[PDB]
Amino acid sequence: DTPAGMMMKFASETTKPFVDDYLLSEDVRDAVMHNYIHIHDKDYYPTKSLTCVQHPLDVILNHGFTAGHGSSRPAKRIETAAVLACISLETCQNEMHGGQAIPAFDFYLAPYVRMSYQEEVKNLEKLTGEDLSNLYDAPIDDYIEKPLDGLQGRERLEQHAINKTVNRVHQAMEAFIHNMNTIHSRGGNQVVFSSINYGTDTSAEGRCIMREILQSTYQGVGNGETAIFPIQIWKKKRGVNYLPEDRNYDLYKLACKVTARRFFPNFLNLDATFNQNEKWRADDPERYKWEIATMGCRTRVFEDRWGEKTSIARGNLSFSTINIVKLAIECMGIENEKQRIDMFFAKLDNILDITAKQLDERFQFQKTAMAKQFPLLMKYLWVGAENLKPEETIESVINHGTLGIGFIGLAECLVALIGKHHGESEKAQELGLKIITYMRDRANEFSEQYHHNYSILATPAEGLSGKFTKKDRKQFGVIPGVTDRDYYTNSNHVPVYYKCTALKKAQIEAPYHDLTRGGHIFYVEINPSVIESVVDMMDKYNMGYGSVNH
């Protein structure tokens, strides 16, 4: 209803028909118009825009930035560091059509906690002329606040400086949360898709950042209201924060308490077999950038076939979802199960080939864009973009993103077309695993054939919940169990209308996480005890990403 939202609606309504013509191939357009492929962000296709990125904030925070005429010097405080993080996210959100993430929020904001502490001790020195130079690089335990009742001497000055640092970090974290939840910067709804990942920083500064962000989340925004953005994600590592002996276990417990009330942060299990990296050393200051980072849109970019297995500075180029329920409904007419399965697999093969060709064509369209079209993404944020002239193509660096082949309604793909759904039957579970494994193998073949990074995606429900189901119900009527819910069940998820305990849901949904390298989530609807149990079952059965709601 806002003028900006109306402008973006007009732009989308004048772009989607345009991309449908002269840009989509004949086969691609035929597949899209026949309710087979949903090309996500079909608007912004003419812009040659990429989907998402994990911002390397060290570059921006240490060298400033110069985007157009907007130039910022290197940060000297937490107050400026948080604002620069917000600025980077907002600026890159206007250059891309997907989420923006901070892979290491605790690692990126941590030197500036020490710089703020040094400013406090230097202000106390100029107030007192006491030459407190031994407190500059001294090791701090946790940056905690104490009443200061009877701590006279240099102890009083040290504790007062720590108190001021804690207050400054608290104000900066409140500012970051409120700016990401209040500033309406992008187009349309205007709220930036913001995510931050933290949990694996054991230093006192990172612990202070995490503690203050958790306290600010716990206190809410404004008058105790829960914050919608940024999507907070807690990185779970055994030996760092999971076991009671671990360094950041207490903060982890605190995180659970916050999830008990504000339902944030989410949890990213770095102990999953697919999320492990052989170059993660617990001592290296750069032990991040070798660990998995996830967005609120569930986009996972970890493995690269011609580079490093990292999530920083990389992202998704574009992803499109495949309607497998439609193929299953089409093959429903075969009475023999074996022939019906063979027909479904042939249809899936054809649609997978079409989707791969569509993603390749969109890649060829995007690669001709010049670096001048993305002032911040292709100058500080992408992998290798610092070696790009403004008037040269991005083809030398675009072959590092991920092409996503998404799917939806596996439970609906099985509820009545080929028997029962995977929540209630073991045969259905085996069939669903077979389908997703076939998709993953074909994605690997596509990656070899087209020289790209293809990954299977458990597409988030937002923006696609009812688009497929309405057309399927129009074409095929009300199929009992399939086209009768007004929404397709989320990908490889137990249907919400099926009453199963969290243990059974986790056991059913665990295998699909390894197959969906492009993204996945565990969803529990329901006290820190229950959150602890959810994380425990995420640990017991290999699961990448998880969240608890109400």
Ligand X SMILES: Cc1cn([C@H]2C[C@H](O)[C@@H](COP(=O)(O)OP(=O)(O)OP(=O)(O)O)O2)c(=O)[nH]c1=O
**Quick one: tokens of 479?**
């199929």
Cα separation, 148 vs 531, whole angstroms: 35
Q: Provide the binding-site residues for ligand GTP, judged by CB under 6 A.
A: 40-41, 51-52, 97-99, 190-191, 193, 297, 299, 459-464
x/- map, 83-102, ligand X, by CB under 6 A: xx------------------
x/- map, 121-160, Mg ion, by CB under 5 A: ----------------------------------------
Residue 437, SS3?
Answer: helix
Please state, in angstroms and as integers, the Cα–Cα distance from residue 332 to each residue in 326, 338, 479, 482, following that order: 10, 12, 11, 11
- Residue 470 makes CB contacts below 8 A (sequence gap 6+) with none
Taking the complex as a whole, the smallest distance from the CB of residue 149 to a copy of itself amounts, in Å, to 10
Task: Tell me the window of 47-55, 265-273, 332-340, 497-505 that interacts with a copy of itself (CB under 8 A).
Answer: 47-55
Peptide bond before residue 375 is cis, with ω within 30 degrees of 0: no
Torsions phi, psi of 321, nearest 5?
-95, 145
- Using rule CB under 8 A, residue 230 touches a copy of itself: no
- Using rule CB under 8 A, residue 190 touches a copy of itself: yes
From ligand GTP, a copy of itself, Mg ion, none, which one binds at residue 266 (CB under 5 to 8 Å depending on kind)? none
> Quick one: 210 or 464, whose CB is closer to ligand GTP?
464
Task: Tell me the window of 169-177, 253-261, 391-399, 407-415 that interacts with ligand X (CB under 6 A).
Answer: 169-177
**From the list 26, 69, 153, 333, which residue makes contact with a copy of itself (rule: CB under 8 A)?**
69
Taking the complex as a whole, the smallest distance from the CB of residue 39 to a copy of itself amounts, in Å, to 16
Interhelix angle 111-128/204-219, rounded to 10 degrees, is: 100
Taking the complex as a whole, the smallest distance from the CB of residue 370 to a copy of itself amounts, in Å, to 7
> Quick one: 171 or 444, whose CB is closer to Mg ion?
171
Torsion of CA 232, 237, 240, 245, to 10 degrees: 110
- Using rule CB under 6 A, residue 175 touches ligand X: yes
Taking the complex as a whole, the smallest distance from the CB of residue 183 to Mg ion amounts, in Å, to 17
**Quick one: tokens of 172?**
């900066």
Task: Tell me the window of 54-62, 317-325, 367-375, 494-502 that interacts with a copy of itself (CB under 8 A).
Answer: 367-375
- Using rule CB under 5 A, residue 350 touches Mg ion: no
Taking the complex as a whole, the smallest distance from the CB of residue 72 to ligand X amounts, in Å, to 4
Taking the complex as a whole, the smallest distance from the CB of residue 174 to ligand X amounts, in Å, to 5
Phi-psi region of 481 (alpha: psi -120 to 50; beta: other; left: phi over 0): left
Rounded to 5°, the CA angle 91-96-102 comes to: 65
- Using rule CB under 6 A, residue 179 touches ligand X: yes
Residue 233, SS3?
Answer: strand
- The continuous run of DSSP H or E covering 204 comes out as helix 204-219
Among 387, 413, 418, 540, smallest CA distance to 489 is for 413
From Mg ion, a copy of itself, ligand GTP, none, which one binds at residue 139 (CB under 5 to 8 Å depending on kind)? none
- Give residue 108's identity as a one-letter amino acid code: Y
Peptide bond before residue 46 is cis, with ω within 30 degrees of 0: no
> Quick one: 237 or 400, whose CB is closer to ligand GTP?
400
> What is the residue whose two structure tokens read 């529990």?
524
> Quick one: 115 or 508, whose CB is closer to a copy of itself?
115
- Using rule CB under 6 A, residue 309 touches ligand X: no
x/- map, 204-243, ligand X, by CB under 6 A: ------------------x---------------------
Taking the complex as a whole, the smallest distance from the CB of residue 316 to ligand GTP amounts, in Å, to 7
**From the list 72, 277, 373, 533, which residue makes contact with ligand X (rule: CB under 6 A)?**
72
Question: Helix (H) and strand (E) counts for the chain?
Answer: 17, 13
x/- map, 138-157, a copy of itself, by CB under 8 A: ----------x-------xx
DSSP 8-state symbol, 73: P
**From the list 47, 159, 171, 350, which residue makes contact with Mg ion (rule: CB under 5 A)?**
171
> Quick one: 216 or 453, whose CB is closer to ligand X?
216
> Quick one: 34 or 73, whose CB is closer to ligand X?
73
Cα separation, 166 vs 296, whole angstroms: 28
> Could you tell me if 296 and 518 are in contact, meaning their C-beta atoms sit under 8 angstroms apart?
no
DSSP 8-state symbol, 484: S
> Quick one: 126 or 338, whose CB is closer to ligand X?
126
- Using rule CB under 6 A, residue 276 touches ligand X: no
> What is the residue whose two structure tokens read 């229950």?
530
Residues numbered 83 to 102 that lie near a copy of itself (CB under 8 A) are 83, 87, 90-91, 93-97
**From the list 16, 48, 154, 178, which residue makes contact with ligand X (rule: CB under 6 A)?**
178
- Using rule CB under 8 A, residue 373 touches a copy of itself: yes
**Quick one: tokens of 465?**
């919940």
> Quick one: 178 or 253, whose CB is closer to ligand X?
178
Residue 94, SS3?
Answer: coil
Among 347, 387, 376, 280, smallest CA distance to 87 is for 376
The three-state (H, E, C) secondary structure of 98-153, written as one string: CCEEECCHHHHCCHHHHHHHHHHHHHHHHHHCCCCHHHCCCCCCCCCCCCCCCCCC
Burial of 134 (0-12, 13-18, 19+ CB in 10 A): exposed
Residues engaged in binding ligand X (CB under 6 A): 72-77, 79-80, 83-84, 171, 174-175, 178-179, 182, 222
